[PDB]
Design a protein around this ligand. Structure first.
Ligand code: HEM
Ligand code: HEM
Ligand code: HEM
Ligand code: HEM
Ligand SMILES: CCCCCCCCCCCCC/C=C/[C@@H](O)[C@@H](N)COP(=O)(O)O
Ligand SMILES: CCCCCCCCCCCCC/C=C\[C@@H](O)[C@@H](N)COP(=O)(O)O
Ligand SMILES: O=C(O)[C@@H](COP(=O)(O)O)OP(=O)(O)O
Lengths: 146, 141, 141, 146
């Protein structure tokens, strides 16, 4: 990622106000509602037939915390995203068979969630910093695909 | 295709936008130019600084076209015909850019509609903007 | 939309494919897997090695679907209805992948139809594959 | 994903057989025909009203040769594409105002033209190497945009 010192600070300042567990559940849930074909990897999660069925699904919420918790830990290593996400990249390709495009869609949903939660605080420059972050994380998760 | 629920969702959200449509269109444009610099290649004649009158004026035009699309949600290809001709034959903005502005419009609406930007509404507005984009690039070739 | 010229161009070029349809479909798939390995995430249950019978078999199915689309170019949505249902409700291949297989099909055709792959036909075929991809993703949400 | 030594050899061996003048003219020509909105940067070139007018247009051929000539020179810098295309990137952004997506579309067309010209010799493995090449070149030309 190519963040300016002023953008790295913006990213960290906003993230320190984020409830990772909640945002994770919200972002994964919205991904499944907005782009329903993504539900293809969650046939074991039970009922995903309506927006509320997805958003309040206890397994979707649990998985969201796991996913964003990893994303969060990745934010402490912006200068080494490929290395930090290496084993998760191998897992998503070799074991889970997850098209990396899914990481990009989740990234966009995450940006919408941050804007929804923070409102005016999620300024245009702050959004631009986060777009660089989600793209970098998505690229790091796609790196070990083959 | 927009379902009955999708249309009910779009009408509710855009209705709450109301008089702020133009401001939101301008904000969406600023977000797009900052997050996706390549989109600026279509506006070399513009002063793209924060709050410029040209961006405000253009944001108003975009928002008005979306208001029109919502008002004729069951006849968008026809209601947006002149605009589709304009983008296809003159402006010729590459198709890939429409999803960028659409994303920034969603972000702008999320930042301004705390109560109405529910997961279902978010889903319907994403489909709506995709439909508008499809109509606007439908005559490209 | 496909113009009368596009339909004529597609019918002529695909008609020349003839008994090689299954072969070209399999070749297109192999090119896609090698060029864009992320597309392999959709075939973990396949032996994807060169000469694979599963790939050859799938190549034939894909080719036959395209033949059916060409034969019913005036109403592809209905001709491909069960197929669009299958990709939307079960397979759920992300929409971004269709241009990848489309590109590889074009490359395959260019490599096998030196005389017929004129700029106009190339344009028509690209539009046609885009139309087929659009129909196949039309029920996604 | 960069090129393996074998892929690099595949690229150079095939390129040594390319008539850059013809391939360049054919590539730009087909770009303007298959994706007509790209004609927006060439209104001073004259008649581009039909496929034959575009392909036979002398300015289209002259420009196709110039563009592919630069592409060809870049193939001698596969390890430093960003550095060798840096000035051209700044030029396409600051003066020409060319959306970098256009570089990706030309890349797609070029691959089709190489397949059209080489037939069976443009094997799937060779195509894969070239796909890496055109993506790298497009990414290099887009790098200085701001
Ligand atoms: C910010 C991006 C993402 C991160 C950091 C992330 C992280 C993780 C983590 C930490 C796990 C647990 C690994 C294990 O079980 O050993 C996981 C599992 C999984 N992830 Fe990802 N993930 C991301 C995006 C996605 C997306 C968008 C999808 C697909 C829609 C996805 C689908 C899955 C699946 C199916 C599992 C296994 C769930 C199960 O246990 O049944 N991931 N991910
Ligand atoms: C939500 C989708 C979009 C809508 C509703 C939209 C709507 C419009 C409208 C209403 C106009 C004014 C036409 C007039 O003067 O009568 C316009 C102009 C224009 N649009 Fe689009 N547009 C969309 C997406 C795009 C995109 C993605 C780009 C490029 C990033 C773009 C670039 C332009 C340009 C450069 C002009 C001319 C502006 C000027 O010279 O004043 N549009 N658009
Ligand atoms: C030109 C567009 C495409 C056409 C015409 C097409 C056509 C088909 C057809 C005819 C089938 C067989 C259905 C049956 O068993 O009756 C099928 C299956 C399938 N398609 Fe699509 N498809 C297209 C693009 C895609 C793409 C882009 C991918 C993914 C990269 C894909 C992945 C699959 C998968 C995984 C199956 C299941 C194959 C199996 O399990 O044996 N399709 N498709
Ligand atoms: C493989 C990618 C490309 C390369 C390596 C390339 C290279 C070049 C070169 C060497 C020049 C001359 C610059 C100078 O005057 O110093 C040029 C000019 C130009 N290129 Fe690119 N280019 C590429 C793709 C494109 C594409 C796809 C478009 C748009 C569809 C484009 C539009 C232009 C325009 C409009 C000019 C100026 C023409 C004029 O002087 O009238 N280029 N390019
Ligand atoms: C690169 C192009 C940037 C110029 C963009 C502006 C256009 O929307 C119109 N002035 C006309 O397009 P055009 O006259 O360029 O077709
Ligand atoms: C250790 C935890 C393991 C659980 C993780 C689940 C991962 C989901 C599997 C990813 C699926 C691979 C793609 C498979 C091929 C499909 O496109 C179609 N054959 C069937 O459609 P479809 O299956 O899409 O309906
Ligand atoms: O040259 C390179 O290592 C990267 C630059 O990106 P960053 O590693 O700086 O994000 O190229 P890319 O993988 O995006 O094609």
């Amino acid at each position: 990622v190519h963040l300016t010192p002023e953008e790295k600070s913006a990213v960290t300042a906003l993230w320190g106000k984020v409830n990772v567990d909640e945002v994770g559940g919200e972002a994964l849930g919205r991904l499944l509602v907005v782009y329903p074909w993504t539900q293809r990897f969650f046939e074991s999660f039970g009922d995903l037939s309506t927006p509320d069925a997805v958003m309040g699904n206890p397994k979707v919420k649990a998985h969201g915390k796991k996913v964003l918790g990893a994303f969060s830990d990745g934010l402490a290593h912006l200068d080494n995203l490929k290395g930090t996400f290496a084993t998760l990249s191998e897992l998503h390709c070799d074991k889970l068979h997850v098209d990396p495009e899914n990481f990009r869609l989740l990234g966009n949903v995450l940006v919408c969630v941050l804007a929804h939660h923070f409102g005016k605080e999620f300024t245009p420059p702050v959004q631009a910093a986060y777009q660089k972050v989600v793209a970098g994380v998505a690229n790091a998760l796609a790196h070990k695909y083959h | 295709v927009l379902s009955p629920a999708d249309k009910t969702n779009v009408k509710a959200a855009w209705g709450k936008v109301g008089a702020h449509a133009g401001e939101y269109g301008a904000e969406a444009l600023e977000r797009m130019f900052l997050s996706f610099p390549t989109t600026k290649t279509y506006f070399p004649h513009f002063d793209l600084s924060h709050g410029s009158a040209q961006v405000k004026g253009h944001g108003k035009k975009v928002a008005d076209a979306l208001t029109n699309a919502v008002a004729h949600v069951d006849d968008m290809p026809n209601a947006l015909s002149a605009l589709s001709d304009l983008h296809a034959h003159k402006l010729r903005v590459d198709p890939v850019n429409f999803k960028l502005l659409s994303h920034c419009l969603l972000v702008t609406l999320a930042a301004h509609l705390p109560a109405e930007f529910t997961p279902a509404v978010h889903a319907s507005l994403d489909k709506f903007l995709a439909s508008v984009s499809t109509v606007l690039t439908s005559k490209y070739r």
